[PDB]
Amino acid sequence: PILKNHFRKHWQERVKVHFDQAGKKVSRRNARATRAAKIAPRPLDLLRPVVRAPTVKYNRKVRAGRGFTLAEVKAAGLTAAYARTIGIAVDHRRQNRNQEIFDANVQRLKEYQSKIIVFPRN
Amino acid sequence: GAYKYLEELQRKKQSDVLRFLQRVRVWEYRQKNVIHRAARPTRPDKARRLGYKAKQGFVIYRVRVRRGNGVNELKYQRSLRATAEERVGRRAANLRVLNSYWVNQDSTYKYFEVILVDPQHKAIRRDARYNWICDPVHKHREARGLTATGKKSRGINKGHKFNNTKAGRRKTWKRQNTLSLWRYRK
Amino acid sequence: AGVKAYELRTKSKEQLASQLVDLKKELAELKVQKLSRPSLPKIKTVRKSIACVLTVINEQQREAVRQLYKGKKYQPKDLRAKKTRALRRALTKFEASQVTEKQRKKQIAFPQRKYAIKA
Amino acid sequence: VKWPEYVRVQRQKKILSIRLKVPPTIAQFQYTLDRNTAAETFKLFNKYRPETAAEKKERLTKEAAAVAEGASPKPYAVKYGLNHVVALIENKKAKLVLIANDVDPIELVVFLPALCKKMGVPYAIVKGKARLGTLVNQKTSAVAALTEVRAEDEAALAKLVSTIDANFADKYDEVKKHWGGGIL
Amino acid sequence: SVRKRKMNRSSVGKATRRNKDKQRKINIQSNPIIAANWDYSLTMAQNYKKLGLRAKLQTPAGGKETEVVKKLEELASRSQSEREEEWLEKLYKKHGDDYKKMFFDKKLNIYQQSEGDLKRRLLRWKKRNG
RNA sequence: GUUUGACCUCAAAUCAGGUAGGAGUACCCGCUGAACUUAAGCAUAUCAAUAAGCGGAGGAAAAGAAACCAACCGGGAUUGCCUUAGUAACGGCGAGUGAAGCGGCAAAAGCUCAAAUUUGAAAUCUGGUACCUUCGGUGCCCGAGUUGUAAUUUGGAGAGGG
RNA sequence: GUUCUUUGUAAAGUGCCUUCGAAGAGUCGAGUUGUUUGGGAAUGCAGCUCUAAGUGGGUGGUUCCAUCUAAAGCUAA
What we know:
Chain E: It is found in: Nucleus, Nucleolus. The structure is cut from a larger assembly and holds chains A (122 residues), B (186 residues), C (119 residues), D (184 residues) and E (130 residues). With 186 residues, chain B is α+β, with helices and mostly antiparallel strands.
């Protein structure tokens, strides 16, 4: 009546068509298989925390965080430097303010520590 | 220590001591070549916090550049400091430009003291704190603006304000100006 | 036909040099017979004979130089590895695996432990 | 006559050192300790040469050759780095701090005489970084300090303090004032 | 092309590498217990659930004791120098157990060490001896 | 002492040992930079922060562990993909230009210096040189170096004692 | 897996008590001409004038509050 066509530039030079969608899925699965073949008994990814999303819109939702904290790791009963060797992602810049999020993470860490089998250095 | 006394001394540049120091040295640097090698840093404090270790393989070159640029304001939007760093990059092509600082200035010339590491020196090739410069991904960092001042002039930082140049302005232009079409059309 | 390499490896410097002079004379005599005839088969084999003798001569010199420069710093630029320019720079295995004094302490104190998550 | 470039530069720098009016935190140098007191400072300071690399190596191999097969006090030496001297001064561990008058960047050692007057450390600006270098196994030293001392040398050191206070600090109370270099 | 045209024409020969079948099936290396019990006909995640071990700790996008006992089996299953020993010999023979006097001694406790350091080191000495 | 000797700075040597240039250039990092065109004729604008030109790298480059985003019940390096979204904002408010946070997902990893004395000891390093188990190690020597090489310390603090 | 070496009052880590405890200047900023951006908030940058502070300083949000630590450096996928 509206329409805006951004074809005033030399658009025909930069046209990326993703024919390799099927090729790149295979490529990532081969990558995962290789990583799991090198990291044999371990999962494939670090233990990630539970986290509340920002903004009025999404604060209903609970999502994965980057890492726990020095606080959540200490309350679980271990050190940050040792947590990384057991494959627990640690976030130094994140803060602890909500009690429900805190306790959920501590129990996630505690249940993780019961389920694991750490190998000795010998 | 001793360098805190130096650091806070060189923050006063028009103060009568450093006024006199700068008066003698500006003239003395005019009498020498344009690009010549410094015996040792004039400001060892600022050299050291920019990562100059006084050991074999570490070089200080002193450099001079003309100032300024509506014909007389046809701009040339690259800095004086990046120009200086590039010139010492070409005269000393075996070295790698680590960092550079301001030393003295004038109506016509701004002076700098570039700091250079010898990546072929065995006192650099060992010691795991400085042997990163031997990796061939650092051949002429000053020519691609990977130094402190180059990263400034490129506008590479974090935030809202640097959205047009955060991954590099050429990269972000090429990315956002691409008609991306999938197998099953979105 | 022609001369064989393994037969010549047993020989000394003087024996091979004399051998070479004889082959160069023989080839020089065959180039005088070449112009009278349409074809000559032996001219090809003697050329390859000379080439072989020179290779054994050079190999015997080079390995002698390898023995007097044995196990020391700075051997000749031809007797050195060729590899490629970009690899004849680029930190050596010692200089690359060289870790700082602090990181070795951190690696003994906290090595990446092996684990499995279920029981 | 025609001289080289660098010769002309250092001669020009020499006459420039004189003919300019200079700020009083500089020219507080060159108003330096006289010949007798300088010789007497070094007659003490030469008794505390830091054990040279050869001497240290031979002694510590003597420790190994003896102690591995079949008590000592802490030894006293002069203290000689600028980071370490300005560490020692302000901790008041310095009894005599010797400062060179000729330093490559002058800006390095400009705070030091006045920081010594502040802390109450009895300082002396002595002539020559080479001359300080000699007593310390280095080419140059910029600074040399004497923290602790053997009791034989203690009374001599205390008198060296009092001689330097009287000879240096009292004669040069006018040097905190007066811009130097007004020579016609 | 320009270079490829010559290389497909020359008598040098191509450096042919047939490394395509090796891209899919990479042998498991880091654990011999897993190396014996890994069905290569199954995938990565299928070989994890077959053994029991959790493959991804975050819940995946999309739709989804035989060996772990053997692991559990293999997981449930600093001396002193000559000079240090002879130093502790000297301290015990001269003092015995008076750690206050033992650490205030300039002749034997040359390094001005505490009481706790001395009783710990002496008990290490006493356990290795009678 | 009208002598001798420390340094400082500046040189030279077919000195010992090294290293830089040129090629390729799809992608990548910079510098430099138009016009035809399109807008009503048209100094803005547009094509376009494009092409051409010049420099500089690698298998990727660049970016990157906040002087970040937000306004929440807060998230948490970068990069990339879907989404935001032709949205916010810009523009003779004209032709036209035009993001980002959030959410989902791919992939994920963290660290290191300078600035506080090793001062009961420059603990550091390069080269030469003789051996050895030689991408190195050891011995001795010349040096670099206190105008600061090592160990400790980097905010997640950290350090000295008990 | 097997095997040879490990050392020296050597190098760490955990928790508590006790005593201390610095953080990148011709840089931020301000003005200014020019370039540049979606960035009207003046978006970034460059030149030139002038040029800071440490219960600092920057960036946001309706009396204040929140969140970062600049002007040094490395790092796979």
